Structures are given as structure tokens and as C-alpha cells.
């Protein structure tokens, strides 16, 4: 599960009730596909700055 390619999650992966559930760091929102993490605003944590 989460041991297999991080469960397909962009960030946090937790194995609940024999299933994989993804989550994100503060400042991100779980995408509709429940895996990807979308930044809430500008300069989200953990991202190198480009502009």
C-alpha cells in the first residue's frame, strides 16, 4: 500500500482500514483525485522559489 510508491500520494500516506489515504502539509489541499496536493496560495511550503 503506502509501501508501494508512497501509495500514489504526492505527500503524506497513511494506511487506514486496509486502504491508502493521502494527505498534504499545511498550505496544500488534496486534489479531487485524493492523491495530489494543490498549493493553497503563493509560496507554498517546500517549494523552491522561481519568481
Amino acid at each position: 500500500l503506502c509501501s508501494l510508491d508512497n501509495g500514489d500520494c504526492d505527500q503524506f500516506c497513511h494506511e487506514e482500514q486496509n486502504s491508502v489515504v493521502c494527505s498534504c502539509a499545511r498550505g496544500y489541499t488534496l486534489a479531487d483525485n485524493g492523491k495530489a496536493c494543490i498549493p493553497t496560495g503563493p509560496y507554498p511550503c517546500g517549494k523552491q522559489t522561481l519568481e
Binding site: 503506502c2 500516506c13 497513511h14 502539509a25 499545511r26 517546500g46 517549494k47 523552491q48 522559489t49
Partner: protein, 234 residues
């Protein structure tokens, strides 16, 4: 930082620097948020009065993005012990919020379990700072970054001459002349996962710098995640 490369534009935005009354940096920090800086508790003994500078890459040319911030609160770990470097962690609340911009952005705080199984099992982490470039050299004028492999706990416990508590971990090389150093202390140790960097450690100490048979010891951030969360609300 001994060896490694200098951080290029916007590559180490979470890097913060603790500067003394004479404006010289003496320790590092990691931007956790607009109000909080994660540093090493042992640095709070390095200077009486100090401030936090962010967005700096070349301490010899005001590039514009620099911002000096006064410290409002110093939240040191109640269990920090000077004699052994145990519980080497401290959080700083700034009087004024840091405005994120180019070269000024926070590192993500990970979740303990996920970080320890997925982040800390990665091949490498990234340590950075304005610390010395040689064991007996001068502090660096340019912000540097070094990819340091995670070191097996036992090979590391064995290599060390002092107790490696459960609050610290090892990273770096056995012989390769690459390693953090004095002045980099309190600085960030981040692990990259899918183009997003998570704070995984705080530069703590080491026997000299880049010495053979010796590694770099970091405070195990994952062991203080609950503590950091509580300190960033008080």
C-alpha cells in the same frame, strides 16, 4: 558547509540566519512559517542578543530580498542538555511576519510516521548554511548546500565518540570531504520528495567537520513534531 555547492537563486528559500549584535551570522535556522524559525537550542547560548535574517545568499552584496527580523519569543526545549547536545531544538517567534518572496519561503513540516518510513529512508537529505568551509576555516560568505546521505544508525552510533541519543541521527560521508560545519548549526536538513522539501533535521554537532570515520549529527526533527506544533501556537 564543507564542499557541496552554493545555493542558486531560490534553491534554499527556507534558510534563515541568526545574526549577533555585530551582524555576523553564528547559527542557522529554518523558516517554518511567517512567524516561526526552527533552530538549534544550543545556538541560544552562542549569543546574548540576536536577530534572524532571511532571503540572504551573499552576505557581501545587499541583493534586495534580504530581511532582518527581531525575535519576540525564544522557545527552547525544556529537556535540552548542554553537556550532551540532547534535545537540541528551539523555535523562535518573530515580532514581525516574514513576507515570502524569491529566496524567502518555508520548508514543509512532515508527519512523523510518514517522514521516518518514507523521507528518512531516502538516499539523501540536504543540509545548508553560511558556516565554515573548512574545519579550521572562516565562515562562508555565500549560502551553501550539500547533499548528505542518511547514515545507518548503528554504523553511526559506532563511529561516534559521544552518545547518539534517540533524539539525533547521522548523515554525511565516512571519508569524503563533504559535511556541514560550525556556523551551519541550527540550520536546515531537508529531504526532497517529489519536488517538495520537508524539514527532517536540525544541524546539531559533529566531531570536527567532515572527518574520516565521523559523521554529521542532526537533531531528529521527526521526534519533536508534536513539540513544534505546540510551540508554534504559543
Amino acid at each position: 558547509i564543507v564542499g557541496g555547492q552554493e545555493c542558486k537563486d531560490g534553491e534554499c528559500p527556507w534558510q534563515a540566519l541568526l545574526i549577533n549584535e555585530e551582524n555576523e551570522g553564528f547559527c542557522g535556522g529554518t523558516i517554518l512559517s511567517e512567524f516561526y524559525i526552527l533552530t538549534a537550542a544550543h545556538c541560544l547560548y552562542q549569543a546574548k542578543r540576536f536577530k534572524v535574517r532571511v532571503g540572504d545568499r551573499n552576505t557581501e552584496q545587499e541583493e534586495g530580498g534580504e530581511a532582518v527580523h527581531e525575535v519576540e519569543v525564544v522557545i527552547k526545549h525544556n529537556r535540552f542538555t548542554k553537556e550532551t547536545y540532547d534535545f537540541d531544538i528551539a523555535v523562535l517567534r518573530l515580532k514581525t511576519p516574514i513576507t515570502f518572496r524569491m529566496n524567502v519561503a518555508p520548508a514543509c513540516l512532515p508527519e512523523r510516521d510518514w517522514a521516518e518510513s518514507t523521507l528518512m529512508t531516502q538516499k539523501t537529505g540536504i543540509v545548508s548554511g553560511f558556516g565554515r568551509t573548512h574545519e579550521k576555516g572562516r565562515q562562508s560568505t555565500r549560502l551553501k548546500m550539500l547533499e548528505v546521505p542518511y547514515v545507518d544508525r548503528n554504523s553511526c552510533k559506532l563511529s561516534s565518540s559521544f552518545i547518539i541519543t534517540q533524539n539525533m541521527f547521522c548523515a554525511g560521508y565516512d571519508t569524503k570531504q563533504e559535511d556541514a560545519c560550525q556556523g551551519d548549526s541550527g540550520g536546515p536538513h531537508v529531504t526532497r520528495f517529489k519536488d517538495t522539501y520537508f524539514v527532517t533535521g536540525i544541524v546539531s554537532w559533529g566531531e570536527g567537520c567532515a572527518r574520516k570515520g565521523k559523521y554529521g549529527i542532526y537533531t531528529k526533527v521527526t521526534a519533536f513534531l508534536k513539540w513544534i506544533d505546540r510551540s508554534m501556537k504559543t
